[PDB]
């Protein structure tokens, strides 16, 4: 427990990506660089499990990897890390998806020395978001995945990469500044100039002051977690991307905007949360109805599920703004479930595009006759995003519905209309996911098969990435207390800190 664990896990892929320009044997494409990034991504995920199974010490509220090193005493910023219940599933989820995102990045031979540098820089930079208990290091880690995810789209992407990359880097750097604006407004409130997330949560702020900080954070966190007014950056950068870049985009980077909503808008700002919680559940339902219709109205294959990622995000906002120990338990569960469901779905889109090279879905039809294991895995991965029971996509949405309309916060004429409107997405998600399956694989009417899509196969490595992603999908769907026991005591302190605010 004396060893620096979370400091190592953050800083290991960053310092090991510097050895990527020094990797020998450039015999053609980068084959040893490809094996080196998997070798460091695997042993860094093993450090997350070794810190978990030996030193996490669950059903304990608070951080148990708390290492507060001094960095700059003049400003007051410290290198303070720590994993509580809101962080440790997403820290474990980041180490699991990005290890497969290196394994998903096997056919990339364009610039392999540059690819695995930026993907390992995102591997150190995404764990660094959930782990740090600070503001100026949180804004550092939030904008640490600003350059390496720009270049992952602008070099290895579809068409209109440069529109998708520069719209994204202007939309998130132009919204991460409100983490600096609101993070500095909170630290200079009062007399203590501390920047750690512990003291800044325990500080008492005025109600008029918190409504500015809550509006600043909602602009900052409504971009990454795509709240439907500030969501236009997503389906361009998510529509023009490769499969391994997309598993970091929708799998992890969307959850950083949901991690910080529970951490920096409910813990630190409880009185502004209660005043502007009913706008979140309104924005959370219309996250679902807008994006599931727009998924049905789109025919681009990579852009269809890219909008479906916005719809599964919409159940998180109903879970956060419900003030329930089961509602908030369904919000953290929806972040882990959609991260495993999306990274399994978006891996197979890049697998399907690697054989057909179209993504337009009109020239497709009858792909399932040629390849069989891809269609067998595309069906089971899309079934998890149908909120099908036996899989974690259902119990993540089941806790949200039960957690909303049992809460003694809203009135009865409000709670019925939200639960009725958020259950329209239960109808709407089989509309486009099954129409995508039908108009690609089901049918005899194949393509030209002479100019485009001359090859068809299914690699056994691509089966393993799907099959190992469906173990935490199904395994949480058959026992949802497997993940809830990581945050049963921490969510019980997040909600009870807001239970003291609700008569207002």
């Amino acid at each position: 427990s004396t060893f620096p664990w979370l400091t190592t896990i953050i800083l290991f892929p960053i310092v090991a990506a510097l050895a990527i320009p020094f990797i020998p044997d450039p015999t053609g494409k980068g084959r040893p660089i490809r094996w080196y990034a998997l070798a460091v991504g695997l042993i860094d995920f093993a450090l997350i499990v070794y810190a978990f199974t030996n030193f996490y010490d669950l059903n304990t509220p608070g951080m148990q990897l708390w290492e507060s090193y001094d960095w700059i005493p003049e400003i007051g910023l410290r290198w303070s890390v720590g994993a509580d219940g809101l962080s440790m599933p997403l820290i474990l989820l980041t180490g699991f998806i990005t290890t497969l995102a290196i394994l998903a990045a096997w056919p990339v031979t364009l610039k392999p020395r540059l690819f695995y540098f930026l993907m390992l820089a995102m591997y150190g930079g995404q764990i660094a978001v959930f782990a740090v208990q600070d503001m100026l290091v949180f804004f550092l880690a939030w904008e640490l995945e600003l350059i390496p995810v720009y270049l992952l789209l602008a070099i290895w992407g579809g068409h209109k990469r440069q529109y998708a990359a520069t719209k994204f880097i202007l939309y998130t750097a132009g919204s991460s500044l409100f983490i600096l604006v609101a993070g500095l407004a909170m630290a200079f409130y009062g007399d203590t100039v501390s920047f750690d997330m512990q003291t800044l949560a325990a500080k008492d702020y005025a109600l008029g002051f918190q409504l500015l900080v809550y509006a600043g954070f909602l602009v900052a966190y409504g971009v990454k977690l795509p709240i439907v007014p500030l969501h236009t950056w997503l389906p361009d950068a998510h529509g023009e991307a490769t499969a391994p870049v997309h598993m970091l985009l929708a799998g992890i980077l969307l959850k950083m905007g949901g991690y910080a909503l529970i951490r920096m808008n409910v813990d630190m700002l409880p009185a502004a949360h209660a005043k502007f919680a009913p706008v979140l559940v309104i924005l959370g339902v219309v996250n679902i109805i807008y994006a599931a219709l727009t998924s049905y109205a789109q025919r681009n294959l990579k852009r269809k599920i890219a909008y479906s990622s916005i719809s599964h995000i919409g159940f998180v906002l109903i879970g956060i703004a419900s003030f329930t120990n089961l509602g908030m338990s369904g919000a953290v569960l929806q972040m882990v479930s959609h991260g495993l469901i999306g990274a399994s779905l978006f891996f197979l889109v890049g697998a399907t595009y690697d054989r057909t090279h179209t993504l337009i879905l009109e020239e497709m039809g009858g792909v399932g006759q040629k390849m069989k294991k891809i269609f067998a895995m595309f069906t089971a991965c899309s079934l998890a995003s149908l909120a099908l029971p036996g899989m974690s996509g259902f119990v993540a949405e089941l806790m949200v519905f039960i957690g909303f309309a049992t809460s003694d916060a809203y009135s009865l004429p409000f709670r019925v209309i939200v639960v009725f409107l958020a259950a329209v997405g239960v109808i709407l998600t089989p509309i486009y996911l099954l129409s995508m399956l039908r108009e690609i694989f089901y049918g005899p009417e194949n393509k030209e098969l002479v100019e485009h899509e001359a090859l068809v196969d299914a690699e056994p490595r691509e089966v393993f990435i799907i099959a190992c992603l469906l173990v935490p999908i199904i395994g949480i769907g058959l026992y949802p207390k497997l993940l809830t026991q990581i945050y049963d005591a921490t969510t019980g302190q997040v909600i009870a800190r807001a239970r003291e605010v609700l008569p207002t």
């Binding site: 007014p229 924005l283 025919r299 916060a409 009135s411 409000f414």
Partner: protein, 43 residues
């Protein structure tokens, strides 16, 4: 809207710019109408 009107079940026929603004005031009015519902009907 030329790429949105592919040879599948889309292209209903109401993609005119006169329809874009009249679909905006109903969609964006329903979100704002539910937001102004939310701050009064909840509590």
């Amino acid at each position: 809207a030329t790429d949105f009107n592919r040879g599948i079940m889309k292209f209903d026929g109401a993609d005119s710019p006169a329809m874009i603004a009249i679909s905006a005031v109903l969609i964006l009015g329903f979100i704002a109408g539910l937001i102004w519902w939310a701050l009064h009907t909840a509590y």
